[PDB]
Amino acid sequence: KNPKSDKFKVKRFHHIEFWCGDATNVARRFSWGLGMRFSAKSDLSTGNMVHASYLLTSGDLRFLFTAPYSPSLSAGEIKPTTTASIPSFDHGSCRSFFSSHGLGVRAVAIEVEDAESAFSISVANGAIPSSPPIVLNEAVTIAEVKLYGDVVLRYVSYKAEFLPGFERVEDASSFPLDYGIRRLDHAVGNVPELGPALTYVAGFTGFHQFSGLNSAVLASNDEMVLLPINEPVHGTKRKSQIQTYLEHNEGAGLQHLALMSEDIFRTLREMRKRSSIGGFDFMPSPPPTYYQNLKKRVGDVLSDDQIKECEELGILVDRDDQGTLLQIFTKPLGDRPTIFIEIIQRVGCMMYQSGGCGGFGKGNFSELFKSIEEYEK
Amino acid sequence: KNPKSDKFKVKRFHHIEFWCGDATNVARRFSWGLGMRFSAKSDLSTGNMVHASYLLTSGDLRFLFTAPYSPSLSAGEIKPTTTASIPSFDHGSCRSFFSSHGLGVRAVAIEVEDAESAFSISVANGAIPSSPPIVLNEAVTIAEVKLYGDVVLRYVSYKAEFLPGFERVEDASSFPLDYGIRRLDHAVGNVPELGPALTYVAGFTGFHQFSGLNSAVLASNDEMVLLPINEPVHGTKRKSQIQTYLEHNEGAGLQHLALMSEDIFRTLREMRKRSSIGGFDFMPSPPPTYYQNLKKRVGDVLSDDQIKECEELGILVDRDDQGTLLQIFTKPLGDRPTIFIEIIQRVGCMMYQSGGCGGFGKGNFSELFKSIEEYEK
Ligand SMILES: Cc1c(C(=O)C2=C(O)CCCC2=O)ccc2nc(C(F)(F)F)n(-c3ccccc3)c(=O)c12
Ligand SMILES: Cc1c(C(=O)C2=C(O)CCCC2=O)ccc2nc(C(F)(F)F)n(-c3ccccc3)c(=O)c12
Ligand SMILES: [Co+2]
Ligand SMILES: [Co+2]
Numbered sequence: 001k002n003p004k005s006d007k008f009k010v011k012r013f014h015h016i017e018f019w020c021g022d023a024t025n026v027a028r029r030f031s032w033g034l035g036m037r038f039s040a041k042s043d044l045s046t047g048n049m050v051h052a053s054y055l056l057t058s059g060d061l062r063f064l065f066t067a068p069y070s071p072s073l074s075a076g077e078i079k080p081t082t083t084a085s086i087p088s089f090d091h092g093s094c095r096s097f098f099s100s101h102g103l104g105v106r107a108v109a110i111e112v113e114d115a116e117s118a119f120s121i122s123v124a125n126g127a128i129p130s131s132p133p134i135v136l137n138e139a140v141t142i143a144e145v146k147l148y149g150d151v152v153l154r155y156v157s158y159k160a161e162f163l164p165g166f167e168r169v170e171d172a173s174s175f176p177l178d179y180g181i182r183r184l185d186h187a188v189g190n191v192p193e194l195g196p197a198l199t200y201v202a203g204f205t206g207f208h209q210f211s212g213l214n215s216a217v218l219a220s221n222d223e224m225v226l227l228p229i230n231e232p233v234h235g236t237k238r239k240s241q242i243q244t245y246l247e248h249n250e251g252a253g254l255q256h257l258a259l260m261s262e263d264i265f266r267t268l269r270e271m272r273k274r275s276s277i278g279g280f281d282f283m284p285s286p287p288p289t290y291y292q293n294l295k296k297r298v299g300d301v302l303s304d305d306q307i308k309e310c311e312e313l314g315i316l317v318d319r320d321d322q323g324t325l326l327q328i329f330t331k332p333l334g335d336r337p338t339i340f341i342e343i344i345q346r347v348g349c350m351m352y353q354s355g356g357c358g359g360f361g362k363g364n365f366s367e368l369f370k371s372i373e374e375y376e377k
Numbered sequence: 378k379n380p381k382s383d384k385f386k387v388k389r390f391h392h393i394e395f396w397c398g399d400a401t402n403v404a405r406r407f408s409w410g411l412g413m414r415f416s417a418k419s420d421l422s423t424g425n426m427v428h429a430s431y432l433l434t435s436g437d438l439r440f441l442f443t444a445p446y447s448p449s450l451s452a453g454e455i456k457p458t459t460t461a462s463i464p465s466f467d468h469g470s471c472r473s474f475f476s477s478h479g480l481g482v483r484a485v486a487i488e489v490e491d492a493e494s495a496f497s498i499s500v501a502n503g504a505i506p507s508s509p510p511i512v513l514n515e516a517v518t519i520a521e522v523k524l525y526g527d528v529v530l531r532y533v534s535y536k537a538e539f540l541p542g543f544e545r546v547e548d549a550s551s552f553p554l555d556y557g558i559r560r561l562d563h564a565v566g567n568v569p570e571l572g573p574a575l576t577y578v579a580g581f582t583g584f585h586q587f588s589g590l591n592s593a594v595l596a597s598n599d600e601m602v603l604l605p606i607n608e609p610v611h612g613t614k615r616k617s618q619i620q621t622y623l624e625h626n627e628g629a630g631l632q633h634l635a636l637m638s639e640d641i642f643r644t645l646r647e648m649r650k651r652s653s654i655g656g657f658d659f660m661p662s663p664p665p666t667y668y669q670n671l672k673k674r675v676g677d678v679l680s681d682d683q684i685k686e687c688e689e690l691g692i693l694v695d696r697d698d699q700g701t702l703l704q705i706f707t708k709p710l711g712d713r714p715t716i717f718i719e720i721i722q723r724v725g726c727m728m729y730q731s732g733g734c735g736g737f738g739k740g741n742f743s744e745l746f747k748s749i750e751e752y753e754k
Contacts, residue, residue, distance in 0.1 A: 021398020021444075022480040022711040029402045032409060032655030044714070052712040067398075067712055070477070070627050099472050100447070103399040175653035250447050276552035278409030278655055334399040335429040335444055337421070 002223065007121050007206035009113035010220040013184040014156050015055075015062035016257060017107035019097050023067040026103065027054040033279030034259075034341075035179030035270055036063060040166040042085040048165065049073040050084035051094070055162050059182030061259060062162070066106075068094045085165030088131035088144050088154075097150050103334035105254040108147060108187050109154035110225055118155040119143035127153075127204035137164035145204070148189045148197055148229070149252030179270035180263045185344055186217075186226035186360070190245045190255040194231035197252075201227065210356055211365050212240045223355035230255060249338045256329070256340050264326050264345035268313040271343070280341065281331040285314035286368055287375035293367070298324055301347060316368070318361040323348030325358030379600065384498050384583035386490035387597040390561040391533050392432075392439035393634060394484035396474050400444040403480065404431040410656030411636075411718075412556030412647055413440060417543040419462040425542065426450040427461035428471070432539050436559030438636060439539070443483075445471045462542030465508035465521050465531075474527050480711035482631040485524060485564050486531035487602055495532040496520035504530075504581035514541035522581070525566045525574055525606070526629030556647035557640045562721055563594075563603035563737070567622045567632040571608035574629075578604065587733055588742050589617045600732035607632060626715045633706070633717050641703050641722035645690040648720070657718065658708040662691035663745055664752035670744070675701055678724060693745070695738040700725030702735030 020026045031038060036056035043052040050073070053066040068091045074083060097106060112118040116133040122145050123129050130152045131144035139159055144152040161168075191197040194214050201207065207218035210226065217228040232242040245255060261267040268282075275281045291311040294302070298317050301324045302310070310317060316327045324347040330340045349357035397403045408415060413433035420429040427450070430443040445468045451460060474483060489495040493510040499522050500506050507529045508521035516536055521529040538545075568574040571591050578584065584595035587603065594605040609619040622632060638644040645659075652658045668688040671679070675694050678701045679687070687694060693704045701724040707717045726734035 021475055022403065024711045025403045025406045025480065026399065028410075028655045029406045033405075038653075043712070067479075069713065070479075070625060072627065073625070095476050098398055099476075102444075102447075103402065173653055173658070177654060248447060248450070250449065276415075276550055277554060278405045281550070334401045335420070336446065 002219075002221075003208055004221045005206040005208055006221045007125060007204070008118045010118075010205075010225055011111040011113070012060070012224055013187070014109040014111040014154075015064050015107075015162075016105055016184065016187065017064040017066060017109065017154070018103065019094050019106040020065050020067040020103060021098055023052045023054050023065040027056060027063075027065040029278060030063060030065070031056050031177060033271065033274055034058065034063075034181060035177040035267075036061070036181070037177055038169045038174045040162040041169055042163070042166045044069070046085075046165065046167045048083050048085050049077070050082065050091070051086065051089050053086065053166070055166065058178060059262075061181055061183050064107075066094070085136075085163055086142070087134045087136070088142065088152075100250045101150065101253055102249075102336045102338065104249070104339050105151060105187070105257070107144065107152050107154040108227075108254070109156055110220075112155045112157050115141040115143045115155035115157040118157070119145065122153075122155075122204040125204040125206075126200065139164055147201065148191050149249075151189065151252075151254050180261045180267040181259045181343070182262050183260050185258040185260040185346075186228060186356075187257055188228045188230065188255045189252065190230050190242050190249070191252040192231065192246060194229055197229050197231070201229070211236065211238065211369065213242045215360075215362070217356070217360065219356065226356055228360060245338050248336045254339055256342050258327075258342040258344050261343055261345050264315065264328075264343055265309055265313065267343055268315065268328060272313065280333070282314055283329045283331065285311075286316065287371055289374040290316075290368060290371035293371060293374075316361060316364050318359060318363045318367070320348075320357070320359045322354075323358035325361055327361050327364075379596075379598075380585055381598045382583040382585055383598045384502060384581070385495045387495075387582075387602055388488040388490070389437070389601055390564070391486040391488040391531075392441050392484075392539075393482055393561065393564065394441040394443060394486065394531070395480065396471050396483040397442050397444040397480060398475055400429045400431050400442040404433060404440075404442040406655060407440060407442070408433050408554060410648065410651055411435065411440075411558060412554040412644075413438070413558070414554055415546045415551045417539040418546055419540070419543045421446070423462075423542065423544045425460050425462050426454070427459065427468070428463065428466050430463065430543070432543065435555060436639075438558055438560050441484075443471070462513075462540055463519070464511045464513070465519065465529075477627045478527065478630055479626075479713045479715065481626070481716050482528060482564070482634070484521065484529050484531040485604075485631070486533055487597075489532045489534050492518040492520045492532035492534040495534070496522065499530075499532075499581040502581040502583075503577065516541055524578065525568050526626075528566065528629075528631050557638045557644040558636045558720070559639050560637050562635040562637040562723075563605060563733075564634055565605045565607065565632045566629065567607050567619050567626070568629040569608065569623060571606055574606050574608070578606070588613065588615065588746065590619045592737075592739070594733070594737065596733065603733055605737060622715050625713045631716055633719050635704075635719040635721050638720055638722050641692065641705075641720055642686055642690065644720055645692065645705060649690065657710070659691055660706045660708065662688075663693065664748055666751040667693075667745060667748035670748060670751075693738060693741050695736060695740045695744070697725075697734070697736045699731075700735035702738055704738050704741075 040055040127145040133143040210217035232240040417432040504522040510520040587594035609617040
């Protein structure tokens with residue numbers, strides 16, 4: 001049941017922005033670990049005296065890494081005279097975000113038809129404004145409203161190359177890394193109370209509903225913008241990982257980013273080769289029991305050798321009434337046990353592939369738990 | 378003329394500590410870019426609720442990367458009950474250092490005979506105390522005094538494995554990277570006024586004197602701890618890079634770390650292969666003129682093929698009355714045009730090799746300048 005109630009025209013996920021202490025080192029680490037190319041920059045070399053911003057791309061996935069310079073470089077500036085390429089940026093906000101949360105996502109950006117009307121309609125419908133619409137070089141419009149915690153939903157609209165003021169990166173500094181990641185599938189928030197979080201976001205977007213936690217998913221009209229939200233379930237045997245998140249993050253924020261791969265086998269081979277030489281680490285692999293039980297539940301989707309390849313790579317598998325999902329989770333991206341990355345690939349729901357095909361893997365909590373018990377046996 | 382006037386017994390450089398916003402991402406970037414292994418950790422997994430610290434090693438070179446957790450994790454703690462493994466660490470100091478300077482060296486640590494007496498003698502002789510001697514697990518003593526800006530000189534002494542409370546890293550997360558770097562050769566500060574800086578540091582250590590800047594070098598008794606200091610020369614045609622440093626760094630601080638390689642050819646081959654895939658970038662190479670002129674001034678030290686190999690790798694060469702030095706400079710390590718790394722290898726002065734053999738390359742300012750003019754010709 002999709003009532004298609006978006007209060008404005010939403011296209012696709014556009015980019016994700018990390019607020020960093022040093023954007024150079026985070027961006028270089030992420031580039032090597034995920035196989036993303038350096039594609040654009042805005043920094044001192046492009047005349048930006050306010051912040052350093054570096055853009056990584058893989059397919060349609062766009063990761064932006066931003067950190068503030070010393071405020072003294074831009075002391076004589078005012079907003080009308082700013083050299084910042086992202087005019088919503090504020091030194092004090094960025095330093096306070098990072099001191100409070102550590103490394104994390106500041107902005108979940110979606111491309112819309114008209115960011116100004118998206119901003120107006122959202123605020124008229126209960127959204128808390130964060131940054132008003134601003135038109136950059138008569139070409140791009142950006143605006144921001146609060147999503148949860150200190151994370152903003154950023155609207156971007158183009159009249160007709162990332163953002164004005166960003167320069168394309170010279171091919172020499174731009175090595176064409178690619179491990180097969182192609183787009184952002186979904187972005188997940190952790191909140192203390194799911195109910196009010198859902199009501200707030202669904203209220204101002206018109207997005208419709210699609211051990212440890214309760215969860216629900218908000219989706220755009222074509223269900224290609226997917227925003228799950230989690231809350232903790234207290235008193236449990238094992239402590240809720242959502243609760244641990246809220247403690248170490250100093251409250252609500254983005255929990256994980258799910259990146260669709262065109263070939264999750266190759267992506268995981270390439271990422272695992274680099275885990276211990278600067279890349280990302282992965283969750284411990286499920287026991288062989290789990291892969292033994294895969295034949296019975298997806299043996300009509302995946303061959304034995306594709307199942308054995310899932311086993312070599314530590315991949316999880318879940319299935320809907322409509323599709324099959326292959327997924328794996330990284331360890332936390334930085335110092336705090338907060339944000340992590342999910343790699344996914346979806347099988348089925350051909351029409352193009354409909355969004356969310358196969359679900360989000362919630363069947364794996366019990367399937368992994370069972371298999372852990374069966375391996376102890 | 379070495380009067381051997383150290384006011385306490387100094388052994389060798391022990392480690393360099395970076396204060397970071399996210400120690401995980403800086404450490405992983407540095408590990409891949411410099412070929413340093415993860416060798417020790419102190420973080421949540423080892424019971425440290427205060428800071429995340431990760432140690433990289435290559436030969437005797439020790440790089441420590443530290444960042445604070447949320448203060449709320451350790452709210453009930455007091456210094457007598459601290460879970461911090463580095464008891465001089467302070468959340469507010471670390472956040473203020475990083476907000477003010479960005480990514481940079483907080484501590485230059487030297488191993489001494491007795492850090493408590495090193496601390497007492499230093500302060501009795503004009504050093505500004507930063508952190509008093511503290512004995513960790515009856516095994517190691519650490520103390521700190523101000524060096525310049527917000528950089529401390531850290532004394533460490535061992536009764537008889539990095540520091541108590543640090544755990545050795547499991548071999549799986551410890552990939553044995555090695556590009557040939559073996560030890561810290563020297564650590565260089567930038568200050569607004571050289572005279573008072575020298576008088577202060579030489580005053581409390583007893584260390585003796587060994588286009589753009591004025592410079593002098595302080596050295597320990599055996600001249601294996603080398604601490605050059607630079608000041609800007611104003612009014613020049615080209616703007617002093619020392620002055621640019623002080624502007625972007627918000628004042629005095631560590632300018633560069635020189636890392637001795639046992640084979641600077643292999644080190645530079647390995648680092649340059651990784652520059653655009655997460656590693657470090659290097660200064661633009663000198664023109665072929667410069668390598669043409671190398672035959673006349675070091676043609677008795679290096680073969681034509683070793684000179685042509687310097688040319689392939691962009692290496693600089695200078696020579697003393699006693700030795701020959703091969704060196705190269707990275708671009709800045711992070712967002713700000715402040716700290717960078719030098720790779721060096723020294724030829725000559727065999728007795729072991731005496732410290733500082735060949736000097737520090739000051740002859741290259743004019744030699745590079747000349748060669749740039751000759752290449753335009
Ligand atoms: C986050 C996530 C997801 C999933 O992506 C996420 C969706 O996007 C939105 C719905 C709720 C949420 O769950 C799905 C299955 C998962 N399954 C497990 C597992 F228990 F099966 F391994 N874990 C897990 C891994 C390590 C430690 C603790 C839990 C997950 O974190 C996990
Ligand atoms: C730092 C350094 C050193 C050297 O290590 C450093 C010593 O440890 C202590 C003495 C003073 C100081 O100078 C030596 C030669 C250098 N020579 C040049 C060069 F001009 F020849 F390339 N540059 C340079 C490179 C790029 C832009 C501007 C200057 C240097 O930064 C440079
Ligand atoms: Co997910
Ligand atoms: Co030097």
